[PDB]
Design a protein around this ligand. Structure first.
Ligand code: CL
Ligand code: CL
Ligand code: CL
Ligand code: CL
Ligand code: CL
Ligand code: CL
Ligand code: CL
Ligand code: CL
Lengths: 185, 185, 185, 185
């Protein structure tokens, strides 16, 4: 099931174009599962833009929209940029990083990128034990101990393709920067 | 708990203004629970506008946004018109009918208007028995036999204040018109 | 789907023998869904025996074990009498009424007897609206407004085969007696 | 929250007597969460007896009844031995090991012994990733990545008080013996 190399992976962006992970060689990669109508939407989306603009050549920031966490991404793929631009964050917000087509990160149909990353990094560094306060919010099947717990978990991979660290829903995106710098030395 | 008269009810619109149901005397009233990012959002929103424009003086159409059904209204109150205008239906869509502040229609905190209507009209005329295929989508407490089953159930009340009929999630909004005409004779 | 006559129904008892509902002609019938390890197990089981012994020829009491309500019947069919005899009620308790093989009363695989009865009697007389306080306890699919709400709902059918009344989880079995007498006049 | 030493723990047996974990010094300890009406009840209960009889002085086998997994322990404490003796396994079965009072192993009210053990041994050795196929069976709060996954997970602790290994719902009790022998060398 699981990719042998990070670089064997791929994804489809919102324009239907393939994102080939071979293009990530020599670059640090930040992957987050994202949601357009989450409580931390505005903050994480602003901070994802900031990070990508700070490291425009040496970092790839990639966001995977997902509706598994409080159903906070009910948009069709063709509606997501509109919602970000006009609703939340709103105010003309546009992503400067790559958003991919909506996927599942947990369960039987989880995206191969997330199967791979959860296998390499089975829990968040900052909060290894929490999964969910309200068990009703676990809606996928099967449920595994390594599952993404909410919108905006974060996976940092180094420039040689080795996943480095996973960060929880409570770990601010912008606070990943010191580890990005370290990996880019 | 339950209002003695339909006309004793009220609601708050999205601008924070009170909608006093006494203003509905002599008018037929169509109340739907609505959601901005539902599969039948575009159709019901278009059809609600059409009905209100067809009966601008003799009908009040009132929509209650609610996030209890697949969490298909995660917008804050101040984001709902933007989402309708720019996302879904999109294309500059504006409601011609009154939208109220987001509420709960089922459970312990259900809006007084819905407590009243479900009491007068405990099941949909066209589908009295269905409640939910997937029991995981029942997220409120307590659960009652008269509960709203999904986004866009419909309650028609006559010009003398007596609730007349309830219609299910599958009953098209525009197909309520013959009953509106009948009640307005 | 639904039987045309009450008398077209049947069930299999714990000894694997067919219970043909034609044998109920001219008799009142009390049907309950039962559970061996419920909070009201001892009371309802004692009261079901008492009623059957009071009307040994003119009443049939029939209990349908079911595991859909808090999973309070996990016994295999061959373990149920042992559990009643030695655990709860315990003390050598034996049913004087007919127990049938464990079934489902709600959802896609609901027993034909319960499909029929819920159709004729879609809510409890004494409590028409309650379904469930904790939505997590609704575990079947699909969920319908007429569904059995907990262990020990009660359905009384008259001697000419017409279902008469349904009673809720809170209505004591022994309090059905006045209606049995009335139906037997 | 978590005990500093395994030996600081205690439990109450079914007779209401304190089981002081200081009495476990110099002994290997096998702790399982158990259920009287599970699919693996007969096998695990037979195998728990066998292990205790094989190491009557050097091993303590301790079973914690728990109703969190398919509600397969609905018995009151005073009914459990009867159910084991007369229902399942039945046939006069009596435990030769210590059963404690029914508890919760997961969530806010989890037993201190299980808080301690899941902290020392956060996943099963033989199956580190599985948690639950059907998310509806996760009924406790909060849900943590280290949670017990079903009836009959197994925790082996060495004679000096250091938890050694955790085994999953699919790992046979009797197959823990080689590790018991190793710990007792
Ligand atoms: Cl750069
Ligand atoms: Cl690397
Ligand atoms: Cl008009
Ligand atoms: Cl009227
Ligand atoms: Cl008689
Ligand atoms: Cl009759
Ligand atoms: Cl020994
Ligand atoms: Cl040790």
């Amino acid at each position: 099931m699981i990719a042998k190399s990070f670089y064997d992976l791929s994804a489809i962006n919102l324009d239907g174009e393939k994102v080939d992970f071979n293009t990530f060689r020599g670059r640090a990669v930040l992957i987050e599962n994202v949601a357009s109508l989450c409580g931390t939407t505005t903050r994480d989306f602003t901070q994802l833009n900031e990070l990508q603009c700070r490291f425009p050549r040496r970092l790839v920031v990639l966001g995977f929209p997902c509706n598994q966490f409080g159903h906070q991404e009910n948009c069709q793929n063709e509606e997501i940029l509109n919602s970000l631009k006009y609703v939340r964050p709103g105010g003309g917000y546009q992503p400067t990083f790559t958003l991919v087509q909506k996927c599942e990160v947990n369960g039987q149909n989880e995206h191969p990128v997330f199967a791979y990353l959860k296998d390499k990094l089975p829990y968040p560094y900052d909060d290894p034990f929490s999964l969910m306060t309200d068990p009703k919010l676990i809606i996928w099947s099967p449920v595994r101990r390594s599952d993404v717990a909410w919108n905006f978990e974060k996976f940092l991979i180094g420039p040689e393709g080795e996943p480095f660290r996973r960060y929880s829903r409570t770990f601010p995106t912008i606070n990943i920067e010191p580890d990005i710098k370290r990996l880019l030395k």
